[PDB]
Amino acid sequence: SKTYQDIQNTIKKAKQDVIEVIEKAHNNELEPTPGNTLRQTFENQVNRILNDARDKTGSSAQKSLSEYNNFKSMVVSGAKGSKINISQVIAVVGQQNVE
Amino acid sequence: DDEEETYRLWKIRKTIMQLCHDRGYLVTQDELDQTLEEFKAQFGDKPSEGRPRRTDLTVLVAHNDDPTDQMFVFFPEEPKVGIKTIKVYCQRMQEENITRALIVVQQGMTPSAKQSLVDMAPKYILEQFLQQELLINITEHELVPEHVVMTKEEVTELLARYKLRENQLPRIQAGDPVARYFGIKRGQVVKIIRPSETAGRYITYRLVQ
Amino acid sequence: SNAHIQNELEREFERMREDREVLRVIFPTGDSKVVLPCNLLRMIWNAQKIFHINPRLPSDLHPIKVVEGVKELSKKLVIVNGDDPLSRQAQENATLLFN
Amino acid sequence: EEMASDELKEMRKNLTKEAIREHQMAKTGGTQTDLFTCGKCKKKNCTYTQVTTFVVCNECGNRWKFC
Amino acid sequence: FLLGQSARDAERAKDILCRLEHTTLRKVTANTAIYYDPNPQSTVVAEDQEWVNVSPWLLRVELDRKHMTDRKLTMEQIAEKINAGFGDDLNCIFNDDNAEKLVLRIRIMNDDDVFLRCIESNMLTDMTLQGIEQISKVYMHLPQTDNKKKIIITEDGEFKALQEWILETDGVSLMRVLSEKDVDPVRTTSNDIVEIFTVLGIEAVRKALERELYHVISFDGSYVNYRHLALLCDTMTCRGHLMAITRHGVNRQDTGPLMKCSFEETVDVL
Amino acid sequence: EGLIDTAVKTAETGYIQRRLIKSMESVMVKYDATVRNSINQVVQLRYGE
Amino acid sequence: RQKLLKEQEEKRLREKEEQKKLLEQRAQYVEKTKNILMFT
Amino acid sequence: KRITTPYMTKYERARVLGTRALQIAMCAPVMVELEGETDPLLIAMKELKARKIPIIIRRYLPDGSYEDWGVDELIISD
Amino acid sequence: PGHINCIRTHSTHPDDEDSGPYKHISPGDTKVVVENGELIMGILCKKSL
Predict the structure, then answer these.
(1) E170 — phi, psi (to 5°)?
(2) Cellular location of this protein (chain A) (predicted)?
(3) Which CATH class for the E6-130 domain?
């Protein structure tokens, strides 16, 4: 019940950051990153922000589990699963990229 | 260009000297790794209608053990070398007992010239090298291993050891840049030495055909 | 007292330095992880655990014994059979990294 | 270029610097830390990435992963 | 891989990158307008550049400044190239490097209306002001892993990997790249199989194929014994030429008619 | 997207494997401790060097 | 110590061999520059 | 002047065991005392362990020559 | 079976443990150590089985 608060805070922070990035791009402040155009660097920054938010949420979820949890036991044993699965189930799924 | 042309000529000369040293012809340690400053001080550093003009920087070098065997390194000025130039070169070479040589052509020679080159093969061996291919020495590249041209005695010894017919050995065409660099012809095996990660060193053989 | 042992050990160290130079010129970028047939560390550990070496007491194993044993094992392990000079050269080249 | 005015020279220098910077490539992202010892260089500087945690050497550049 | 001091500082590497990158008029030109100016001194447009220097038509090919500075060019070499490429048939009156507009003036001296259109088109499409063909654009990225960092044995003994600038092109030339100065002619591979066979040699092709295969097979974290990779590489480089694994490379070998029909082309080989 | 990727992989990898197997189906290590093929052409003086 | 000294003098012998090779190569260069001259 | 390996490869061992088992199944004399078993394959394995199989292997070389090795001559792997 | 000897690391093995103290005595029961075919330390996982 506290991990939910942390996850919501992180998601809101990520949303605010991406909105600020969009505003900067609209008002012509985000300079093009070397080797990429303006749209390319904008998309790269957005994706990096989203991935950082997802990783933070997953780490917060993982650190909030109990030794008696079964997902964590099966992941640490490596029999079937992974940390990303727990992150998607509890914290947040993530970006649905295509191509 | 002036400076760039001089740099290209110097690099070509260094590559030719390294090639001759690799084949076995005795060469100075000085000219083998001479810098460009002495090259300027020697010729004149004015290739654009000046002293360092082609056909004058040619070098004749004799073999290590066979001082009677030499080879010229010409530099025809004609961008598209014809047949008259090679004809006069061969005619002037006929005075000496020399047989081998090396032609440095600006651009790719006309097909009519290759026929004449191969025609005089049994009597006067001569090959060609585009200047674009002489600006770099491939044998020093990381991918290219260390080649060693073998003698007939050891080739026969090898064939007899494994009881394997020379036809069964790997093949390597004469068009291979390494093959032309070492001057190997048909019916001749070349030793290869590659750094083996699973066995330290591994030596294989390849017959030219 | 014996100087022959000292000379033999010096020769062994010189050969070790030569092998190190060969490895450096053959394995660039310093990659220690290599694949070889016999895991010598595991064998040594098994010998220690069987014979009860107890690595605290002074052991009874002269260096000359080790040198001669290694030289003989370097001879016994053959890949290119034959006393021919080419055969010996190939045997040395093949069984080089393992030695 | 040398005969150009001060303002023109400054503008040319700024354009050249901007072009040089833009020609570069963005460095690979990651969480840099000194808790992992790289086996290819013996240094501690490196960067990790969780996805299995990929290890990227900072100085030596040893690439590995931990499960 | 840069060889000279440029490997360390990016200032002396940008020029190398530019000279290895294909630049044409289209990349540096911004506007191109043809005018039928009768008298050269009349100058229908307001430009005080022709009277100082001194056919009833000309081309005003004004160039961009930002791109020209990015590639670090000068109008002198541009004029020299545009005059030598088309013989002593035109007269390009370049402009000084002090004015704001980078205007030019191309005139022809000795059906004639479309000649200027044709020449401007065929020069704008391809002129090779500074660079080589094939190579479209070049990147400039630092090595983050040991697979591209420079390694030198230090006097103390430790390898001490060094971080040096390296380029990443988008084409295949190799031959014309290695000849360029400030370029290590020992570590600059090509990432292509057929190209190396016409530059280095068959053994180099074998090594390059081995390295590429190991790279593409070890990218997902998997591991394959090197023996299998070596065996595949040797089999593809046994007859000197790069025999293709397809029906067009294995059926050419003198294996036997009963073995060729099994893979493919049954009735043809029979 | 994932399902389509799996379907195309399941169709392409089979052909890739078939071509790889039909090019080295006769290679073997003879009793002369050397790797050759059906034409007795030596490919490696020692298996895996 | 004596073995070190004899190794050093053997290196000196190899240095003298390098000297003789250099002098021989110069003595043939004096003759070969004549051909390089008459060629043009 | 035999140069082939002095060890028995797995292929040869398997083929020899199978052939000896087939021969035993066809009412052939054994080369070891039977402790009370009947499976011909087990008898063949026991004979191989006892090094009494009357078979000699002819390893053909790539050149064309061959070498005759006896089961009781070379070392067995398993 | 037998007298096996091998060393393996557990999935949840903190990297900052070998350098500091408690190397041969791990609070988290990691650093698998087998001697004479007897499990001594560590928790078995896919890394060891």
Answers:
(1) -130, 15
(2) Chromosome; Cytoplasm; Nucleus
(3) alpha beta
